[PDB]
Design a protein around this nucleic acid. Structure first.
Ligand SMILES: [K+]
Ligand SMILES: [K+]
Ligand SMILES: [K+]
Ligand SMILES: [K+]
Ligand SMILES: [K+]
Ligand SMILES: [K+]
Ligand SMILES: [K+]
Ligand SMILES: [K+]
Ligand SMILES: [K+]
Ligand SMILES: [K+]
Ligand SMILES: [K+]
Ligand SMILES: [K+]
Ligand SMILES: [K+]
Ligand SMILES: [K+]
Ligand SMILES: [K+]
Ligand SMILES: [K+]
Ligand SMILES: [K+]
Ligand SMILES: [K+]
Ligand SMILES: [K+]
Ligand SMILES: [K+]
Ligand SMILES: [K+]
Ligand SMILES: [K+]
Ligand SMILES: [K+]
Ligand SMILES: [K+]
Ligand SMILES: [K+]
Ligand SMILES: [K+]
Ligand SMILES: [K+]
Ligand SMILES: [Mg+2]
Ligand SMILES: [Mg+2]
Ligand SMILES: [Mg+2]
Ligand SMILES: [Mg+2]
Ligand SMILES: [Mg+2]
Ligand SMILES: [Mg+2]
Ligand SMILES: [Mg+2]
Ligand SMILES: [Mg+2]
Ligand SMILES: [Mg+2]
Ligand SMILES: [Mg+2]
Ligand SMILES: [Mg+2]
Ligand SMILES: [Mg+2]
Ligand SMILES: [Mg+2]
Ligand SMILES: [Mg+2]
Ligand SMILES: [Mg+2]
Ligand SMILES: [Mg+2]
Ligand SMILES: [Mg+2]
Ligand SMILES: [Mg+2]
Ligand SMILES: [Mg+2]
Ligand SMILES: [Mg+2]
Ligand SMILES: [Mg+2]
Ligand SMILES: [Mg+2]
Ligand SMILES: [Mg+2]
Ligand SMILES: [Mg+2]
Ligand SMILES: [Mg+2]
Ligand SMILES: [Mg+2]
Lengths: 260, 168, 167, 69, 77
RNA sequence: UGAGUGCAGGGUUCUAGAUCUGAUACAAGUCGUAACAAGGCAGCUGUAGGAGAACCUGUAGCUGGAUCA
RNA sequence: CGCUAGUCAAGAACGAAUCCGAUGAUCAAGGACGUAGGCUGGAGGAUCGAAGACGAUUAGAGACCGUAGUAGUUCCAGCAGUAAACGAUGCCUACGCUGUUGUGGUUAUGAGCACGGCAGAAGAGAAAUCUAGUAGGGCUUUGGGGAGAGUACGCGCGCAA
RNA sequence: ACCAGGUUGAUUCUGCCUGACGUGGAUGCUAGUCUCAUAGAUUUAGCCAUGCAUGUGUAAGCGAAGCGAUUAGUGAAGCGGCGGAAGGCUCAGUAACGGGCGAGUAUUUAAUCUCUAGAACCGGACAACCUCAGGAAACAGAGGGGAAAACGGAGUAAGAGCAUGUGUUAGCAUGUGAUGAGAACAACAGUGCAGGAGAGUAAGAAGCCAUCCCAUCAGUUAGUAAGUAGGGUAAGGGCCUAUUUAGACGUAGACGGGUACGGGGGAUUAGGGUUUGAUUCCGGAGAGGGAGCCUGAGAGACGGCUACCAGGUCCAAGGACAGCAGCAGGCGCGAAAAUUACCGAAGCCUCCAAGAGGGCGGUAGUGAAGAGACGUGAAAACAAGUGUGUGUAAAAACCACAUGAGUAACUGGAGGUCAAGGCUGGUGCCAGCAUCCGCGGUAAUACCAGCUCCAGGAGUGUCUAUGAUGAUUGCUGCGAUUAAAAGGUCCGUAGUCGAAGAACAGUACUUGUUUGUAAUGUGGCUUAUCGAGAGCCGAAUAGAACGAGAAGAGUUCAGAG
């Protein structure tokens, strides 16, 4: 190919967006920005599907030309702007607030929140560097950058951000007995508490988890975000609190256990 | 050409086998079906359920057995086809009932078809004039007409079927 | 023009390979720059991604570092004495990395004379500086960076290279 | 036409030879064996005529249709 | 130096294996110069290209074994 | 960096050719009758001569022989 | 491979409380032997006898039969590489019923070990018959309806055939 | 998970031919209604008349002529900005960075995000405008004004590389320095543009593993294999060059030749298999054949430029133009494939945009390639028509109600395999039929016809490839005394295969956890009258990361032989 790709066929787009295969050959190619393309969704899919407020391209235009929609405290005017996980969306007229989370199935979903929960988000720490003029810096998963934060924050920790000031508020590390949320894998959207961590060299660390209704599951650190100072969670999670059931369990719970 | 849609019939390996010819001839005659394709279609349907029962009984694991047995038996009860007192949460009866499925016959699927139901409920003088009332819109279910003789009637729809007089 | 692709090259087993594409610009090469000694002449080349590269065709002077005493000076270059790759580049006086060159010694002479131990520490350098001999080695890449820079030969480096010059 | 070979072909029907003139165009077909092989009692002939002047030979012979003229 | 690595390939139809090998040319440094010789087993690490064929460097070795130069009893016993 | 084009060669695939020589099919033509019966000299395998033609003759072998003696 | 003596190397089997310790099975490529007839050079030449020549027999015999007759048939030094070179049954290694008869050693004289012949049985097989019973033991050669064809072209060996 | 007919006067075997059944193309005859898919791939990557497929403007870069004005305004020729490197078409070439799985460097990246973040003066032209005015056309001249956020210079911030300290390695210190800039505007209340550091997207180069036929192709290679040093590139590297070392690859098939877009997948199938993949998704290559190239963040671009070779077009003869493996369409070639149709609507992409553009895409028309559901009467009482409404971008079809009525089957067969007539008339080894076996010489259930039956049925016959039949290719699973088939005998390398006893180790081996699959397929549920269809769910192959078990395999030992 002579240069950069512009289009995106409908069968190639992420299974997390959950778009119907048969209607048309194309899907919206996300603009470059905060999260990766595989870990985010364009804004126009949210307004037409996840939270229905438009039904046609003429309406999608009008909503943003009138400057109505705010993401992380700034007004947005690109219809193909990417939104990702733990990412406050709001309309200042009618004072609505939402976070973006995963269903138990791993699709995307908007969750309504109060104007308290709307003030902060969580991210993971990726690198630490010193910059010209001897200025310390720190960086995060979604392309965030921070000047003169607390030096003790370590790579791999997770940090809570105040959306109005754009400063770090709190820090939590990967240890036994803390709450975790699952970003990618077989168990997307599950929520649980750390049983035990097995350290590996030059390779990913393996983390073992207990679920709130008893189930053990393990995954690699690269798929986990840590979502509380010790015991209990920061953000409010969905109507169902992240318990996943097998078809087998759904049957037992529906028709009763197999008797002797 | 390769294109969308399944094929629902299997052609018999021997075109002029005398025991097959005679036994097919009888069943088309008695039930007032259009041609051999109607019959062969029902035969493939019947074979499919028999295969599932075979597979369940020979499976090694318990999770699949307990899960998929229930689904199979409930489905065939709703169609009004497999009529017996299956009890759930009891492994032996599930096995017993799976074995009773293995000698199910196409006659049982035929008798759920609307053309036969209409005649059997004494709303028509023959299996022929039953078909002729399903054409020409005289037959109605839940207050709506049904144009197609092959409509398979689930268990308990029998209360809502009706006939009306001709338009003339 | 010139290419850097391995299109035309044989396999490790000695067999030939067939060609499956026309040439591509993303493996283009460029002709050599042969930097000569003379009054300054430098050309600016528009490179991939819109960057600029500076190509010295003629150079007169260099920055030369003294490593032991920690100072740097700017001086004229006379001629090439030795070149490790090819005897030809010496006789035609072409400048490259790792060429050994004669320079004006007087600025270095004026500085090194201040140290009372100088004669005792390096007698062969001292002798050379008296006789009007001053030798340095080029470290920059003139065809890439657009200028020449180096360090003054001292101690065992003199003892090594002087044996390459002599008839 | 496709090879510039000259070949022998058989003409199937009762009065079939009468439906063909010299310099007519004919389409020609296989006898149905695994390799190209002789069928029945005809020695060394490997093809048969199918259509004459764009029309079915079966229709010509049985007088169901007429020559294009 | 040339290193040989060996393995088995499974052929599904006949339900059996065939032996295979590949040749890799590796860089040996002067620090190992006297110590490594033909038949020995060697550990190599990956790097950026060093030449047309060369991509690995010898990083250490396991010397082809002797358990013992077996004991001879004294004539006195 | 090189398109095109001179002049010699090769490598492939097809095709022409006076004349010679195989094979196959020849309803039944001409000359004999070599094999199948001890087929009228028991047959056959190797090798070497000879001959209108099947074949005949020397030498060693075999029974699938007309002899389990 | 068949007369008698003398001489020179190596092998098989048997008896037994000898020594070494995995040195082994089968085999593309490569190498050595191979009746007879044939070929290159020397020695020799009794008997027999391709070719060639006659006498008979026959329609005709060029053949069969008889007379005669040459190359060959023998030896030394080599080339060649085929046979119904067949028990038409590959080589190691197993598990397997009885009676009888041989050959060579050894013997508690009761028998064994190696190499054979014969006659039944049981299984097997399309039968005839059985080197063919039982069997996912190992390794090599090899066939896939008749013909054309073990023929054409190319290649390797050979003095030629 | 299946057989049948055919060597003989009969029999039992070996063995092959033929029938019976899926699927991809071609074709004969016949054809009522509605719904879902798909169409010049096979032969010539052959040749092309015509029309269309790429352009974009605000309150907010510069604004000439014209119109008009108490020294206002207007409305815009050109310039600048951003795109034209995506999508669409095809499979020629390539046995290979062409393909699958991991990893993130030795690299460059306009737009976009987060943090941060800007005191600058001067000068000409180019295009349009104005006056002449050339050329058959295509296309151009003189002369004179005049702008920019366009362009070139000045100062000035900044600043590559080199050297030494200190912190791998950013950073900081010191010495030395080539180079060397910069956008604001509007208020409907905003939109831009300079520098850095990190992200995000896209390439370039790399690691491992798998890949077709011929031995009547056995030796191949000399930038070839390596080293030291340098040039070159965005970057590692024989990528290229100088002097030294002789390597590298092969019977476990090198080298040569023939052939091929590769996967996800498709067809058949009890199991083990055998065949195919131009063709909705991903990646690669091309634009008549070869080769060079400017501009740009990005092309060795062809709806850009330049030259040759093969072909064309217009001329006033001097010159000019052009490339349908885009969408319709034409000619050829063949046994082989649709309309020079509508589109401010759906899905997406492009711009300076409350708007403009798109043959990309959607909508219908055409055709028995494929796949669903139903008509052709009932015993009292039956499609297809028509009119309104709906439906859509506008339509047609579909569906609702209301009117008329009484229309609607063919293809192959009837001696055996193989379902169904020794019926009647012609013909007499003729004419014909017959996959195979076989019929006909005047008493033909087999030809040519009439009449009755049979089979499938809006469908049925034929030809051609392939899978099955087939244990006639044999891993599972065939044969070699006489049917086809054990080398004349030894030695022997590569190759394949190899005691008992006591111990040992974990790379194969098996298994856990975690990754690895959109569509298709598999197990399900829910809504279109029903059924294909549509929508949502669950699990999954090969391949890779980390642990575990030690029977078999492997390695060692000798108070074992
Ligand atoms: K004879
Ligand atoms: K001899
Ligand atoms: K004679
Ligand atoms: K005579
Ligand atoms: K004689
Ligand atoms: K004699
Ligand atoms: K010999
Ligand atoms: K020999
Ligand atoms: K032989
Ligand atoms: K013997
Ligand atoms: K046998
Ligand atoms: K020959
Ligand atoms: K017979
Ligand atoms: K057809
Ligand atoms: K093709
Ligand atoms: K003129
Ligand atoms: K074009
Ligand atoms: K076209
Ligand atoms: K067609
Ligand atoms: K429709
Ligand atoms: K008929
Ligand atoms: K008839
Ligand atoms: K008759
Ligand atoms: K065969
Ligand atoms: K076998
Ligand atoms: K032989
Ligand atoms: K022993
Ligand atoms: Mg490429
Ligand atoms: Mg005779
Ligand atoms: Mg005789
Ligand atoms: Mg011995
Ligand atoms: Mg002799
Ligand atoms: Mg042998
Ligand atoms: Mg044969
Ligand atoms: Mg096409
Ligand atoms: Mg493209
Ligand atoms: Mg096309
Ligand atoms: Mg090709
Ligand atoms: Mg400036
Ligand atoms: Mg050189
Ligand atoms: Mg393909
Ligand atoms: Mg291209
Ligand atoms: Mg080009
Ligand atoms: Mg293009
Ligand atoms: Mg299109
Ligand atoms: Mg019958
Ligand atoms: Mg018949
Ligand atoms: Mg056989
Ligand atoms: Mg025989
Ligand atoms: Mg034989
Ligand atoms: Mg033999
Ligand atoms: Mg339905
Ligand atoms: Mg073992």
């Amino acid at each position: 190919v002579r240069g950069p790709r512009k289009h995106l066929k409908r069968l190639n787009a992420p299974k997390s967006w959950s778009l119907d295969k048969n209607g048309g050959v194309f899907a919206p190619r996300t603009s470059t920005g905060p999260h990766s393309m595989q870990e985010s969704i364009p804004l126009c899919l949210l307004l037409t599907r996840i939270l229905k407020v438009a039904s046609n391209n003429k309406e999608i235009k009008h909503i943003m030309k009138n400057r109505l929609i705010t993401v992380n405290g700034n007004i947005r005017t690109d219809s193909r702007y990417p939104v990702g996980i733990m990412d406050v969306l709001s309309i200042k007229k009618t004072n609505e607030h939402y976070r973006l989370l995963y269903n138990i199935a791993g699709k995307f979903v908007l969750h309504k929140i109060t104007e308290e929960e709307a003030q902060y988000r969580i991210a993971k720490v990726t690198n630490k560097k010193v910059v010209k003029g001897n200025i310390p810096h720190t960086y995060t998963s979604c392309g965030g950058s921070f000047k003169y934060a607390d030096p003790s924050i370590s790579i791999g920790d997770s940090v809570k951000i105040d959306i109005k000031t754009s400063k770090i508020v709190e820090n939590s590390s990967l240890e036994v007995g803390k709450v975790v949320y699952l970003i990618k894998g077989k168990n997307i959207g599950c929520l649980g508490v750390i049983t035990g961590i097995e350290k590996r060299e030059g390779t990913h660390d393996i983390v073992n988890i207990v679920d709130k209704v008893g189930r053990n599951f393990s995954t690699i650190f690269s798929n986990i975000l840590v979502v509380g100072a010790d015991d209990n969670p920061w953000v409010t999670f969905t109507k169902d609190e992240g318990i996943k059931y097998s078809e087998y369990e759904q049957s037992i719970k529906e028709y009763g256990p197999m008797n002797e | 050409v390769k294109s969308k849609g399944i094929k629902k019939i299997v052609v018999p390996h021997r075109p002029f086998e005398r025991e097959r010819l005679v036994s097919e001839m009888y069943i088309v005659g008695k039930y007032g079906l259009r041609n051999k394709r109607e019959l062969w279609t029902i035969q493939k349907m019947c074979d499919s359920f028999k295969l599932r029962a075979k597979d369940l009984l020979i499976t090694p694991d318990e999770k699949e057995f307990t899960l998929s047995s229930r689904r199979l038996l409930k489905k065939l009860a709703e169609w009004g086809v497999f009529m017996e007192d299956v009890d759930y949460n009891n492994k032996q009866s599930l096995t017993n009932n799976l074995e009773k499925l293995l000698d199910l016959a196409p006659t049982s699927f035929l008798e759920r078809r609307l053309q036969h139901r209409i005649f059997d409920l004494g709303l028509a003088s023959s299996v022929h004039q039953a078909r002729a009332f399903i054409h020409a819109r005289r037959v109605k279910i839940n207050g709506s007409v049904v144009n197609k003789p092959g409509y398979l009637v689930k268990d308990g729809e029998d209360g809502f079927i009706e006939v009306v007089e001709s338009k003339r | 023009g010139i290419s850097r692709s391995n299109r035309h090259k044989r396999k490790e087993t000695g067999g030939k390979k067939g060609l499956h594409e026309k040439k591509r610009k993303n493996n283009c090469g460029r002709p050599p720059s042969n930097t000569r000694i003379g009054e300054r002449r430098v050309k600016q080349v528009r490179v991939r991604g819109g960057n600029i590269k500076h190509r010295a065709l003629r150079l007169d002077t260099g920055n030369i570092a003294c490593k032991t005493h920690n100072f740097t000076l700017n001086t004229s270059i006379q001629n090439v004495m030795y070149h490790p790759s090819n005897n030809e580049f010496m006789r035609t006086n072409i400048l490259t990395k790792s060429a050994v060159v004669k320079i004006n010694g007087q600025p270095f002479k004026h500085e090194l004379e201040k140290d009372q131990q100088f004669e005792s520490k390096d007698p062969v350098l001292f002798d050379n500086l008296r006789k009007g001999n001053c030798y340095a080695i080029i470290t920059s890449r003139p065809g890439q960076v657009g200028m020449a820079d180096g360090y003054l030969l001292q101690g065992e480096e003199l003892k090594f290279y002087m044996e390459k010059f002599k008839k | 036409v496709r090879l510039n070979k000259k070949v022998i072909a058989y003409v199937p029907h009762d009065g079939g030879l009468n439906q063909i003139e010299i310099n007519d165009e004919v389409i020609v077909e296989g006898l149905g064996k695994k390799g190209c092989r002789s069928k029945g009692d005809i020695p060394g002939v490997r093809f048969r005529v199918c259509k004459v002047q764009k029309v079915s030979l079966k229709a010509l012979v049985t007088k169901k249709k007429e020559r294009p003229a | 130096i040339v290193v040989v690595k060996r393995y088995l390939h499974y052929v599904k139809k006949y339900k059996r294996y065939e032996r295979r090998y590949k040749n890799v040319s590796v860089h040996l440094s002067p620090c190992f110069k006297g110590l490594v010789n033909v038949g020995d087993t060697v550990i190599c690490g990956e790097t950026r290209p060093l030449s047309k064929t060369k991509r690995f460097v010898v990083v250490g070795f396991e010397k082809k074994e002797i358990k013992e130069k077996k004991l001879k009893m004294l004539s006195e016993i």
